[PDB]
A paper describes a structure:
Many protein filaments function through dynamic cycles of assembly and disassembly, characteristically using energy released through inbuilt nucleotide hydrolysis activity to perform work by pushing and pulling other molecules around. These dynamic filaments have been termed cytomotive, to distinguish them among the wider class of cytoskeletal filaments that perform organizing functions (itself a subset of all filament-forming proteins). So far, we know of only two protein families that form cytomotive filaments and have inbuilt nucleotide hydrolysis activity—the actin and tubulin superfamilies. Overall, however, the picture is clear: The tubulin superfamily, much like the actin superfamily, appears to have a shared subunit conformational switch upon polymerization.
Here, using cryo–electron microscopy (cryo-EM), we solved solution-state structures of recombinant Drosophila melanogaster tubulin heterodimers, purified in both guanosine diphosphate (GDP)– and guanosine triphosphate (GTP)–bound states, in addition to a structure of MTs polymerized from the same material. (C) Cryo-EM study of Dm MTs prepared with GTP. (F) Cryo-EM map of Dm tubulin polymerized into 13 protofilament MT. Comparison of solution-state heterodimer structures to structures of heterodimers within MTs recapitulated results seen for other eukaryotic tubulins: As a whole, the heterodimer transitions from a curved to straight conformation upon polymerization. Meanwhile, within both monomers, N- and C-terminal domains rotate relative to one another in both monomers, in each case accompanied by a downward shift of helix 7 (H7). The curved-to-straight heterodimer transition and the within-monomer between-domains rotation have each been described as a “tubulin assembly switch”. Our explorations of simpler-than-MT tubulin systems therefore appeared to confirm the straightforward conclusion that the conformation changes seen within eukaryotic tubulin heterodimers upon polymerization are not determined by the multistranded nature of MTs.
Numbering used by the authors:
A (entry chain 4C), B (entry chain 3C): 2 to 37, 47 to 436
C (entry chain 3D), D (entry chain 4D): 2 to 426
Write the structure that this text describes.
Amino acid sequence: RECISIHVGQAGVQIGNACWELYCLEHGIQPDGQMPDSFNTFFSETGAGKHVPRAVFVDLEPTVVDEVRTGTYRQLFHPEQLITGKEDAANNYARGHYTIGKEIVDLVLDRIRKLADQCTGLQGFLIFHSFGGGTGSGFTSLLMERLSVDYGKKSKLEFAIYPAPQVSTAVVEPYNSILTTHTTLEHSDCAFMVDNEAIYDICRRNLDIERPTYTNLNRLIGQIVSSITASLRFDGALNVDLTEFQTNLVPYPRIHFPLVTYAPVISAEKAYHEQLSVAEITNACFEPANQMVKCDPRHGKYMACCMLYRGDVVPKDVNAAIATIKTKRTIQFVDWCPTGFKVGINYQPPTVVPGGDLAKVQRAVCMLSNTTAIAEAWARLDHKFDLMYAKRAFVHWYVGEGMEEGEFSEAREDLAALEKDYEEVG
Amino acid sequence: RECISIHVGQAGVQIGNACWELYCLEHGIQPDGQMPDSFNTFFSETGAGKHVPRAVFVDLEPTVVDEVRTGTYRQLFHPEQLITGKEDAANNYARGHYTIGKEIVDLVLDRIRKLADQCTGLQGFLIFHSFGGGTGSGFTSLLMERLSVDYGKKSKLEFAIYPAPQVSTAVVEPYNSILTTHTTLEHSDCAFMVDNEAIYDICRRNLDIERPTYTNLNRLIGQIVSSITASLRFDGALNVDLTEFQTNLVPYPRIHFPLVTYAPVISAEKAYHEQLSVAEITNACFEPANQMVKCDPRHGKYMACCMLYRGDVVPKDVNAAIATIKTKRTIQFVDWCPTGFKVGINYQPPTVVPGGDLAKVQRAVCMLSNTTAIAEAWARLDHKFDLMYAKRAFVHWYVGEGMEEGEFSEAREDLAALEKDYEEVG
Amino acid sequence: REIVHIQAGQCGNQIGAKFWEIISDEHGIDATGAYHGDSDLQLERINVYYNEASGGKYVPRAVLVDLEPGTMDSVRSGPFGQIFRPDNFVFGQSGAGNNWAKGHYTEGAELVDSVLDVVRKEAESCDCLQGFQLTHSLGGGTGSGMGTLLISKIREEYPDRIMNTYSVVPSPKVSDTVVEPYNATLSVHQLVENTDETYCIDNEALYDICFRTLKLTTPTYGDLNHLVSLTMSGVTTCLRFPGQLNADLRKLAVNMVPFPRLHFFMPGFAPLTSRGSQQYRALTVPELTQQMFDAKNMMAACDPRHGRYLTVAAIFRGRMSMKEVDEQMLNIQNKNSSYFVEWIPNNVKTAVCDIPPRGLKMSATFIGNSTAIQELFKRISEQFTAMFRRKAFLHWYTGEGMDEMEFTEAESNMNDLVSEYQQYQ
Amino acid sequence: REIVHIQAGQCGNQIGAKFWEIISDEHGIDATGAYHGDSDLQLERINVYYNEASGGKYVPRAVLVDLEPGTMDSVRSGPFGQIFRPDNFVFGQSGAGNNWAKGHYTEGAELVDSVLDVVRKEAESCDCLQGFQLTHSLGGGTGSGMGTLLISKIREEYPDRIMNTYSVVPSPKVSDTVVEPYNATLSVHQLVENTDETYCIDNEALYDICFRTLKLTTPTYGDLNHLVSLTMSGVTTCLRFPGQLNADLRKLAVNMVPFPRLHFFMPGFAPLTSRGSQQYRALTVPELTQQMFDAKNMMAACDPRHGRYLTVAAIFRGRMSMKEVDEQMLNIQNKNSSYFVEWIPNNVKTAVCDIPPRGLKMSATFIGNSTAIQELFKRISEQFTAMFRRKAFLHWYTGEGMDEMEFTEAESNMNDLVSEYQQYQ
Ligand SMILES: Nc1nc2c(ncn2[C@@H]2O[C@H](COP(=O)(O)OP(=O)(O)OP(=O)(O)O)[C@@H](O)[C@H]2O)c(=O)[nH]1
Ligand SMILES: Nc1nc2c(ncn2[C@@H]2O[C@H](COP(=O)(O)OP(=O)(O)OP(=O)(O)O)[C@@H](O)[C@H]2O)c(=O)[nH]1
Ligand SMILES: Nc1nc2c(ncn2[C@@H]2O[C@H](COP(=O)(O)OP(=O)(O)O)[C@@H](O)[C@H]2O)c(=O)[nH]1
Ligand SMILES: Nc1nc2c(ncn2[C@@H]2O[C@H](COP(=O)(O)OP(=O)(O)O)[C@@H](O)[C@H]2O)c(=O)[nH]1
Ligand SMILES: [Mg+2]
Ligand SMILES: [Mg+2]
């Protein structure tokens, strides 16, 4: 059982940088690759006292990847796993998909096949990227397009960063974040949406951190990915696998956008006073003040949700805690879901990274609900795209790169239908 | 069996400060929350060697609460339990109830629900506040209105400070103390009234202290509260419960204003010469020179009284001492009350706080009687309010904040009717 | 809760210069913006008046305004002159010439835009403010000219914040300018509506206090500005330090003002003792309260014995006891039952703080709203009376666009104000 | 990603001389081409501006162009004069005499071949270049006459590489030449179609910033050229040093220009503080954000308050926090909702770098594309109309071969640009 991760762009590399430091702490492996088992899921062992990850780094700009090449973690990777270009897409999806992407899309695909040869039980790939730039979107959309045809039925997971409606840093963001909808819709088995706004509020209130910079936000995402795969890397009372988890969660082929949340996140000094028991932690996951996307489930009806407990949990009370939630009329479920819970209990406590903003805890929970409230996170955005497309602003940049003026018709048409389904099922 | 205490305003927080130092000494719990049983009634345990109270501190001004945050008892209170504002109500009921009310009332009602989730057998609430300022009157009236709807039949107790007729500290006091009566009348199961100037006389004569400041008065109130709840926290010859206490004392739904008094209070040096036995401490409770509100029972007729003894008491004589009182025609009871004494004897002697103004004893008594002498403490005040309201002084402040001019009609009309009921039953 | 500071004219700047000398020593800062204090309570509420800077320095939230460059030259080079930021000094080049007309219409209208750009900058920096402090005098042209103009322009933008002005009103016995009654009457026309709480002081009475109670043989403008500052600093001591019972600026306004137009106050301070007679004095509350209510100690040339107190306040500083403050207040009301209004029971507001003034154990400040002010305005209206009959000095003001109608309103509105105080007396 | 430099005219060289003095100190390079730095990050992209030489010396990618040999002698003998390669100094012997006719047709035609052989030599030296930088003025003859001829020839050879112009456009209030309007209008005819993005700067405004904000009493061309250099140095700091979020020349161009013809920019820099008022200033992002948007600091002689911003940028330098940059940007948009275009949400671009300017902790650069430029072109156009109406000074230019048609379209084409900006206002 082995899994392969692909990072795209500055967002992907920065997120990927935090995770692969987190994994090394978990398995007791020093930065120079030597260990002073179960690690085969992510690592490959070479002869004697040398482990290297199953990672590949991709970018069209040499600046950010060179930071990995010089930093403390230079010795972990192969030299050939770190792929850089010469000219960035300059926040153009059209440049990414058609112009600059194609000269590098072949090089990595030759490298993916080399890594997929070592593995024996490939479950799937992990993709970290964002919808902000064209480099992270146009190339990734091309990169999954090649993966899906070549490999077919193996599961691919994505961990996207959605653009916020208010707190955004670019001018042409909506044009990219609509054109990516097609490729994710029909070439991804499961898509995770994470917002930059909501992580700020979580940092401000729960963690009581004054000035959250991108170091701390990336550490939060590293915990979510670590928890989902801890079912494979360790052993416990009940087990849930990726194929098992997709079966219980995705009810229809077109509805695969779970919303994630984590519990507990607590500051060091405020952690001493509170006694963190399973009865309340399962309640914290349903607080709309802790959802990782600026979305209100109060306007939606739950479809299913998956709980991933780890630490010191026994199944006697989990059903009792789950029973407690079902009695609330505040937390609503669809009528054809009398049961809407998948439960997995693991034995390994989460590990705290030194230099982080979290305290050591004995228990942890990850929540993954497929709700119908997420309709609004696209409905608001399509107004931004359509308002700007009224005067045909910025379009001259994309047209000259090979796209057609009708290409933006399908982008809003596809989101027209995809939003239509959720209200239909809802 | 647990209870939740809410302190509102400078007066409430200051009184609450005195209490929680008293409770910790009783149970041997150090200021940092660690214990070198029965403590579940007020305390919650967190893992190992950590106890935190079931208390919430509320204010609209940071000055009187951040005194707690830096003080010796910073480690005991959970940081989220201290709620502060940015602008005080400035002795306006209208600002407290209407303008400055709603931006903070929601936060605590969210915080009460979290505290009420941990409990299993919630007995009731204890509310500490005063009728002087609008912050403690306008806001506290709003909190009880929201509490009653959410919880309904659960009993709520308050410990209010009535403004004195002669020794008063503000100009606009009568306007506030009339507007609180509606929400106390219709939304309180038991209301305790205490007067500031009366406690001065008790300090002057009985304790022989030259200059009682607000430290020593607040220590006296801590002794009254601790004794009423000592029946839950310990076990003895007879038991009286909070819901048991209301049944015997309150004869009609509109008449729930008991007068409190205590025995014995004595200086350290004069404690040696006297012998304190059950025969006299039952007589000290009935002295009009020891009533806690400047009212004369000689012009009233008793309806009921409760006598809570603790320490070294035997039921053989308590019935005899109660028998002795009944033979006096100075102490009058109403005809429809052939018997009017509810008795509870407990086993734990009261504990003296070091640095205090009281001497260690083997027995103590707390008295709670429902008489008609208190009718005057409202009639005198209604003259003050009506006299000033003749010229519509100060009213311009309240009208602009959301009130209307007929609102003061209901404030006086309600106190018009309530005084009649005491007259009728009398 | 933090407050910005505005000073206008030679009169205010000389008053305001002493304030930052006294309050700075209170909070422990040196003359160069450095800090060297001991008690932690100094840093708890440092920001009520100051702004932080790089390198661990503090600068005050003050604005110095002028229509002549002479006075800024003095304050800049004086003691504690480098504390202020250079950008704050706002001054013109022409002067006012003791004209109210030039200050409002001709000269100040050009310079008014500059100051509002600065007070806007200080208003945004503060997170949640409550009030503005204004220091000026009612005799000259600049202080009464622009001082009236900003108050109207300040008020319109911020109708929800409280406003404070600490005025100095002229007196006949120390009369100094031939055209004083023209200036004073025109300004108070708009202070009756555009300010929330107003203090009045006399240079006549400040001479009465200085010779007799202080045993001062040489009262210069150094010492008078000393006395006004201590009343100025005392009101807002509840904000900067804790206390057993608290009172900020907003509490006093609701407690003292029965009707919107009756907000003209009278200061008073105690103790004030000579350098040799202090060794022969007690240290107790009852001696403080008798001095506070003494008609021989007020800071306006009006005796309260010709009227009755509406409401009063007392601000105590030091380690004291609550009953003793309570028993003293009832003693005065019972003994002096003639001098208090009857239909407002218990006319006294109370407040006690913790930190005493440095080198002292106790202090007190008296702010008492009385009906005796009606005489202090009639006396001015009499001096104005004999001048406007024969149109003396009128041509100087009429040159800038005013009319006989405006002077008619100046007397009529001053007539209305005195009527209100007589009616409720 | 490394870029070559072109300078034209006396103005450009005096601007360009300071840029290489500043940027060399930024990278640690001495006055003689040696290197003596400490941080390795200086060497990571040292090649972005310089070319390697034997023996451990560095020479820049500079080309100095002139039509008179006077200025080349000064720059050669001036500070940092030996840095340049001698072959780069290209200059003639006759001069222009403020003739735009002579700069293009008579005198630039002979000398244009010589320089293009040199820029080709640098174009072969480059591995993978992106742009050309051109620095000139729109008043004289050489800078506009040759510069427009350089751009025309450069563009045809390299239709895909990015082209930058940092122009100085004349102002009526600092008018210095009788035939300025003929020069300015005839050049702008071709900057519309042969450049990618253009920066406009006025000598009138740089006086305003020097006297007022800097408290400079004697602003000479030594100091004005200091200001413009910091803007050019700031734009390309993402290329030479790392950062949390990056922005190169291609990202800005796509993020600024909604339609191909609306590419005229206005810079602005912050902080700019006097040597005495710096001790009394904070060090935070929120102070930096307000300064950039201040209409008293924008470095062109046109008011943005007369129009609405299309888009803006902000390049920040220093070790900072990412939400703080994000929170302030929403504050300005919400508070100033009147002054931004409505049909493009979130009109702000952002970039943060790590290496701050030497001796400073923070910095910011503002690039705002507005509709307020439409007035800065009408003022020039009016000066042209009163000239060509009566054919004053026309005979001097007609002697080299232009005709009334060429001047006729000169106003007609510049008429179109004013039409576009008003249309989208
Ligand atoms: N979590 C996280 N998000 C980032 C980070 N950097 C940029 N982003 C997000 O990315 C969005 C902008 O598009 P990018 O993902 O940065 O495009 P890019 O990373 O430059 O990829 P390329 O354009 O190919 O170089 C912004 O809205 C940010 O929310 C980061 O370091 N961590
Ligand atoms: N026992 C006791 N009574 C107090 C104390 N402080 C104030 N009081 C009483 O409170 C009355 C005045 O109203 P307050 O209760 O102080 O109103 P407040 O505490 O200021 O509440 P806010 O206005 O919201 O700040 C006075 O008549 C005092 O008798 C105290 O510390 N202990
Ligand atoms: N208390 C006090 N009053 C002063 C001082 N200097 C001047 N005055 C008074 O201010 C009045 C005149 O005000 P003026 O100086 O003309 O105001 P300006 O024109 O704005 O400077 C006179 O009646 C003086 O009594 C001072 O230092 N202290
Ligand atoms: N910023 C700046 N502008 C200058 C400088 N020298 C001249 N100018 C401007 O350039 C304009 C004339 O252009 P000029 O340099 O004479 O063109 P030339 O024929 O190449 O010399 C005048 O309006 C000056 O304001 C300088 O050193 N710095
Ligand atoms: Mg990038
Ligand atoms: Mg208070």
